[PDB]
Design a protein around this nucleic acid. Structure first.
Ligand SMILES: [Mg+2]
Ligand SMILES: [Mg+2]
Ligand SMILES: [Mg+2]
Ligand SMILES: [Mg+2]
Ligand SMILES: [Mg+2]
Ligand SMILES: [Mg+2]
Ligand SMILES: [Mg+2]
Ligand SMILES: [Mg+2]
Lengths: 219, 219
RNA sequence: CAAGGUCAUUCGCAAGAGUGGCCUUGCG
RNA sequence: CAAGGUCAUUCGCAAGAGUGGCCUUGCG
């Protein structure tokens, strides 16, 4: 029907269109035929394609660089960017749900498992379809790759270097409805203390940690 | 030669023998050409091989069952078992190191990345070599697969069901040299408390939890 | 899968690195 | 990547399921 329109974006024609439909169906829309298992298989397939390239083109091939980068190139956030070219929102089948960024990420992966199977489990061919559509995007993403350490990690590495000690984080208070909480955390190392807040302990512990870092860059 | 002996086991001959040597060389033996990067790629390749089988033959296809099982089928523990057939201890190059279960695990992974590459990056052929050698073992392990939940998980799931509360663990004491520490932990829920000891907090907390389950289910 | 500190041990003139144990952080 | 509890919400007679938020556990 309109599937033929997605097959054109992919540049591949299924023999079993029921297969392609499964990749596009959420659990809410059909309890029997949905993408959950194909997403399982898709994860592997795609992780493998990404890793294949990463290893060939990465500028820095250190474990500490490669892992953080691979984690991003394989993340939901990154698959939503690649999935734009395919306009999945108009093909996905869902009942009373809202096609969020989680869904898209899952159908994206499931879609690749779907083409693999349909192509008689041909891994090279599928790896080719994928590169034909995303290599450029991935190669550039890699070219400008950057490990972005989070505050907690940073702070912890400063205090261990300087004093060989780790900061402490203690919960000061919690407020709001259970589905809408606000946490106030305290970060402390030595006699330096700072607070932080956010929708979760970690988010709050993070904010508190950024402030302690600056509180130390100054003292 | 002797690497020709390994090629006979794998059932594949390299065009670039030095690549094969790379997969077998640990960092201490050579700072320039060793297996770290290949193991990175091999990790993905194999993950993909196991997943493909898991989804076709697994008796149960629920995510809660497939994740644990996939966890096992790609673990060091399992690669050492599959690697026995290859006798890697006699091909691996190590300088003053001890060919541990971790080294073998990485060379196993690195060996398959090396086949892939030398194969002109043919993922089908490589997936077939892998199966010709391990499908039976894998199919067997899958056939007898079973999620084996740990004590901390079991316990936490008992307290949440009955009281909707989680147990708390607290460090009671630490003994020994830093490279040899003995921990004693306390588990508690309500007015029930038990101790546990081990080489780490975690191991200590587990024993503590196992006994708490026993204390509860009994009392 | 990565990151930091630490103990033991091996290599090294040093820098640094390898192996094993522990604490902790991040991501999935 | 999985597991459990909970809050909000949607579907439901109920059982239970989907979506979002939080606490925690395990593995890598
Ligand atoms: Mg999944
Ligand atoms: Mg994923
Ligand atoms: Mg996913
Ligand atoms: Mg690696
Ligand atoms: Mg591995
Ligand atoms: Mg490994
Ligand atoms: Mg590792
Ligand atoms: Mg998931």
């Amino acid at each position: 029907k309109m599937l033929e329109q997605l097959e054109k974006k992919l540049g591949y024609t299924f023999k079993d269109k029921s297969l392609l439909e499964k990749a596009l169906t959420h659990v809410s829309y059909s309890k029997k035929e949905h993408y959950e298992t194909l997403e399982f298989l898709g994860d592997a397939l795609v992780n493998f394609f990404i890793v294949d390239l990463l290893v060939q083109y990465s500028p820095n091939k250190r474990e500490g660089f490669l892992s953080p980068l691979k984690a991003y190139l394989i993340s939901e956030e990154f698959f939503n960017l690649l999935a734009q070219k395919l306009e999945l929102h108009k093909f996905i089948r869902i009942k009373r749900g809202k096609i969020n960024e989680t869904i898209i990420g899952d159908v994206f992966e499931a879609l690749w498992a779907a083409v693999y199977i349909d192509s008689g489990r041909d891994a090279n061919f599928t790896r080719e379809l994928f590169y034909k559509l995303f290599k450029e995007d991935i190669l550039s993403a890699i070219k400008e790759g950057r490990v972005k350490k989070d505050y907690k990690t940073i702070l912890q590495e400063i205090t261990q270097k300087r004093w060989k000690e780790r900061p402490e984080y203690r919960l000061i208070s919690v407020e709001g409805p259970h589905h809408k909480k606000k946490f106030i955390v305290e970060a402390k190392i030595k006699e330096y203390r700072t607070l932080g807040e956010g929708k979760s302990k970690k988010e709050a512990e993070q904010r508190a940690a950024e402030e302690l870092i600056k509180l130390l860059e100054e003292s």
